[PDB]
């Protein structure tokens, strides 16, 4: 909808306003900026994933990549099941812990959930 960019915007050398999509060799970092009522200005800078991975050893990164691609296969499965059977959203009916355990679970920072015989996740009693 870039009819015709306002002549005012010419003076901003560092900004170029594209009226059509451009496929590039890549983008490294971006800046989103929003402003709000009552002097509410915010800005966030996001940087490309590769740069995080460059912290790791090919050893690590490649171990992770196998994890990811396994997840995607679960995800893929789920998403398709959901579309068909209208279950992309599943309401939980009970917390992970029986009420008996609750206070304890809350208070022990180690307590974690183990997969169960029915594929479900619960805290061990």
């Amino acid at each position: 909808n870039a009819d015709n960019v306002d002549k005012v915007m010419e003076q901003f050398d560092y900004i170029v306003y594209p009226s059509r999509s451009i496929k590039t060799d890549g983008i490294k970092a971006f800046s989103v900026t929003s402003f709000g009522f009552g002097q509410k200005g915010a800005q966030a800078i996001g940087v490309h994933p590769k740069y995080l991975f460059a912290t790791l050893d090919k050893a690590q990164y490649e171990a992770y990549c196998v994890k990811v691609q396994a997840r995607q296969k679960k995800a893929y499965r789920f998403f398709h099941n959901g579309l068909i059977n209208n279950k992309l959203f599943v309401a939980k009916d009970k917390a992970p812990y029986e009420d008996r355990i609750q206070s304890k679970v809350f208070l022990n920072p180690q307590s974690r959930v183990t997969q169960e015989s029915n594929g479900e996740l619960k805290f061990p009693a």
Binding site: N1, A2, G41, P49, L56, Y64, A75, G82
Partner: protein, 337 residues
């Protein structure tokens, strides 16, 4: 599959995007008849109607001199006659200029996704967007059961920072208007008008976390302020994973209000300019005049890179920085600085 495109594309495009407001999507709102009420002072008695003894009293309480009520000795009913001088409210309608608004596709329902009927009935539509959103957002991140988080992390490290400008606009109307009008309305509508009730429902239905809940109201910018809040929260040990985003709905009362401020674009005037709904919104244009109302939410889940890699979840980007900023001294609240 091959036919889908032919059968439906035309419709799909016509009933999504920035389009003419569709009243069905808003319980009958039609900018072309904006209902108001005008106080009239009756200059006559008007004829009697029957009423319960209780209602009669109610009427007499409010009107006094200007109402007569008497028993029907036969059926314990009563009769209400307003007298001259009494005050009445007569509906009238207006032709509002904001005919166009960007609205969720004509047909979308949180039920297709699997939100339970009872929860559908109980909560503000806003929450429904937020619920579905967070659900699809957890999938995009490879989490099927949010409980998986509690394989790697303690209950107190999944955080919830979703906000909005004024969410629960339907419930809001329900208590400030629909209740005054004596229309059938929930007892708990107050619950669903709070900005953080959305966040609450997310936790009461999916993540049963004792994590933090910092929920922001940064008007047009909440969604970023939210990212910021979750960010800080995570880098202070409060949490390792964290839902973030913003939401807000489209409402008769909202749309009308923005128009009074001068922020939205006058559809009628833009139609006079040969514009089309959709050609309406031109961010950098010369002809740009005002913004476009729209609805919905947006969410991103966020984590420490460590927990991310350890879990083995997708990584879309690095939140390199966030921040919020006030401008100078002024008197124009809506002004950008």
């Amino acid at each position: 599959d091959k036919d889908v495109k032919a059968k439906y594309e035309k419709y799909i495009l016509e009933h999504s995007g920035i389009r003419l407001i569709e009243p069905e999507l808003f319980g009958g709102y039609d900018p072309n008849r904006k209902q108001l009420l005008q106080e009239v002072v009756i200059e006559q008695d008007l004829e009697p109607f029957e009423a319960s003894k209780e209602q009669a009293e109610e009427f007499k309480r409010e009107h006094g001199d200007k109402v007569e009520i008497f028993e029907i000795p036969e059926t314990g009913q009563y009769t209400v006659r307003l007298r001259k001088g009494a005050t009445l409210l007569i509906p009238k309608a207006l032709q509002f200029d904001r005919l166009v608004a960007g609205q969720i596709p004509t047909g979308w329902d949180a039920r297709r996704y699997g939100v339970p009927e009872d929860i559908i009935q109980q909560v503000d539509p806003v929450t429904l967007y937020v619920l579905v959103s967070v659900a699809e957002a957890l999938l995009s991140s490879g989490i099927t059961d949010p409980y998986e988080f509690y394989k790697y992390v303690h209950l107190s490290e999944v955080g919830n920072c979703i906000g909005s400008g004024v969410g629960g606009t339907s419930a809001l109307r329900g208590m400030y208007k629909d209740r005054y009008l004596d229309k059938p309305v929930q007892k708990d509508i107050l619950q669903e008008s709070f900005v953080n009730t959305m966040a609450a429902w997310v936790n009461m239905l999916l993540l049963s976390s004792t994590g933090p809940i910092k929920t922001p109201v940064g008007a047009c910018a909440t969604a970023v302020e939210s990212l910021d809040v979750g960010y800080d929260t995570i880098m202070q040990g409060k949490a390792r994973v964290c839902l973030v985003g913003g939401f807000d709905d489209f409402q008769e009362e909202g749309s009308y209000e923005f128009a009074n401020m001068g922020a939205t674009s006058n559809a009628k005037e833009e139609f006079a300019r040969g514009r089309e709904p959709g050609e309406m919104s031109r961010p950098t244009s010369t002809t740009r005049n005002g913004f476009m109302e729209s609805q919905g939410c947006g969410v991103q889940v966020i984590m420490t890179a460590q927990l991310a890699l350890e879990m083995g979840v997708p990584i879309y980007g690095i939140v390199a920085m966030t921040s919020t900023a006030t401008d100078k001294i002024g008197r124009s609240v809506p002004a950008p600085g």
